[PDB]
Paper text:
We solved the crystal structure of unliganded human DNPH1 and took advantage of the slow reactivity of 2′-deoxyuridine 5′-monophosphate (dUMP) as a substrate to obtain a crystal structure of the DNPH1:dUMP Michaelis complex. To investigate the structural basis for catalysis of N-ribosidic bond cleavage, the structures of unbound HsDNPH1Trunc and dUMP-bound complex were solved with data to 1.7 and 1.42 Å resolution, respectively. Omit (Fobs–Fcalc) maps showed electron density for dUMP but only in half of the binding sites of the dimer. The 5′-PO42– group of dUMP makes polar contacts with the main chain −NH of Ile29, Arg30, Gly31, and Gly100, the Ser98 −OH of one subunit, and the Ser128 −OH of the adjacent subunit. The dUMP 3′-OH donates an H-bond to one of the O atoms of Glu104 −COO– and accepts an H-bond from Gly27 −NH. The other O atom of Glu104 −COO– is locked in an apparent LBHB with the Tyr24 −OH. The uracil moiety of dUMP makes nonpolar contact with Ile76 of one subunit, and its 2-CO group makes a polar interaction with the −OH of Ser128 of the adjacent subunit. Glu104 −COO– sits underneath the 2′-deoxyribose moiety of dUMP, 3.8 Å away from the dUMP C1′, a position suitable for nucleophilic attack on the anomeric carbon of the substrate. The main change reflected in the active site upon dUMP binding is the stabilization of the Ile29–Glu34 loop via polar interactions with the 5′-PO42– group, with the side chain of Arg30 closing as a lid over the substrate. An intriguing hypothesis for this observation invokes the enzyme harnessing the binding energy for the 5′-PO42– group to drive a conformational change that traps the substrate in a caged Michaelis complex conducive to catalysis.
pmcThe enzyme 2′-deoxynucleoside 5′-phosphate N-hydrolase 1 (DNPH1) (EC 3.2.2.-) is responsible for catabolizing toxic 5-hydroxymethyl-2′-deoxyuridine 5′-monophosphate (5hmdUMP), a noncanonical 2′-deoxynucleotide that, if incorporated into DNA, must be excised via DNA repair pathways. DNPH1 catalyzes the hydrolysis of the N-ribosidic bond of 2′-deoxynucleoside 5′-monophosphates to produce 2-deoxyribose 5-phosphate and the corresponding nucleobase.5HsDNPH1 also accepts canonical 2′-deoxynucleoside 5′-monophosphates as substrates, albeit with very low reaction rates. The dimeric form is common for DNPH1 and is essential for catalysis. The overall fold is similar to previously reported inhibitor-bound structures of HsDNPH1 and rat DNPH1,6−8 with a five-stranded parallel β-sheet core surrounded by five α-helices.
Residue numbers in the entry:
A (entry chain A): 19 to 28, 35 to 54, 71 to 158
B (entry chain B): 18 to 54, 71 to 159
Write the structure that this text describes.
Amino acid sequence: MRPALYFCGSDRTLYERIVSRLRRFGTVLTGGDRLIHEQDLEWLQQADVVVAEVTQPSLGVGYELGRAVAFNKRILCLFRPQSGRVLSAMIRGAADGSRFQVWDYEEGEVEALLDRYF
Amino acid sequence: GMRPALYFCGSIRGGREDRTLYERIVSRLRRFGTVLTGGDRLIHEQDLEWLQQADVVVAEVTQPSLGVGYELGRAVAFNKRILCLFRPQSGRVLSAMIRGAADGSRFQVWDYEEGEVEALLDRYFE
Ligand SMILES: O=c1ccn([C@H]2C[C@H](O)[C@@H](COP(=O)(O)O)O2)c(=O)[nH]1
């Protein structure tokens, strides 16, 4: 009955701010490692939008984004240039401005960016 | 083609700490096949083309990397044969998404020590 949102993230305060604001727009869907992987894959397939905070390098976040692209999901990636890091070319280079968006942001504005996207 | 096409993935923008090991792996992979591996878009598109051409995808997954994870996720969805190599001597716990993707056949994750990487590759490709 509500949109289904999937959040990926490797910072705790910013993650909590993002997850809390996502609840305005829908349900945020997000044993052993295999059971974790299969539950995450099931939630990815159910998701209407996949949101990832990509400032911290993470194999798991990258993997989730790769699976999400192959499932043809709408994807929003959020990067903080103030980190001083250069974002992976595989993530920056996947952006097409519509179905796969990569947005640079300053920490104070993250809720305004999500409101604009949703 | 004649030779198996091999795709190698390792951290770059996530960190170049293991660059010298990557060269040793690529050197041994060359024994068993052809190693195939707007600036960011061009890197993404060429890498995806090589990934699609690959018969085997080999990834060193010790250093956390968005790009290596992304390549592995696209490779799984392309139903590629995948070998991931992880070094427990790093002190790291490998991401559950990578460890949990392993099925022991088409997606394998092997723990190894740096000194045995040539013997590991010889066994996998035998
Ligand atoms: O500038 C580059 C060149 C290659 N790759 C591809 C090939 C590597 O296997 C992997 C490294 O990803 P990062 O560590 O740069 O995120 O992605 C990049 O992401 N960025």
